[PDB]
């Protein structure tokens, strides 16, 4: 990590945005959460997908 692992955030940024069933507040919340605590990036990303999988029909 020369400057910073910003690349990881980029992936989770758009990947989360891709899910269309996440509540408007949740979509903005997780993406902002990255800045709040980059250490949880892997968790937040997984957590975001969890909301997608859960809120999704069937």
C-alpha of 1 from chain center: 21
CA distance 43 to 39: 8
**Which two tokens mark 11?**
């992936």
Give me the long-range contacts of 43-52 (CB less than 8 A, separation at least 24): 44/12, 44/16, 45/11, 45/12, 45/15, 45/16, 48/12, 48/15, 48/16, 48/19, 48/22, 49/15, 49/16, 49/19, 51/19, 51/22, 51/23, 51/26, 52/19, 52/21, 52/22
The DSSP symbol for 40 reads: G
Domain residue spans of the chain:
1-58
CB 50 within 8 A of CB 19: no
| CATH no., domain 1-58 | 1.20.5.420
Tell me how the structure was determined.
NMR
């Amino acid at each position: 990590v020369d400057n910073k692992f910003n690349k990881e955030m980029r992936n989770a940024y758009w990947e989360i945005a891709l899910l269309p069933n996440l509540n408007n507040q949740q979509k903005r919340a997780f993406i902002r959460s990255l800045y709040d605590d980059p250490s949880q990036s892997a968790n937040l990303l997984a957590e975001a997908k969890k909301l997608n999988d859960a809120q999704a029909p069937k």
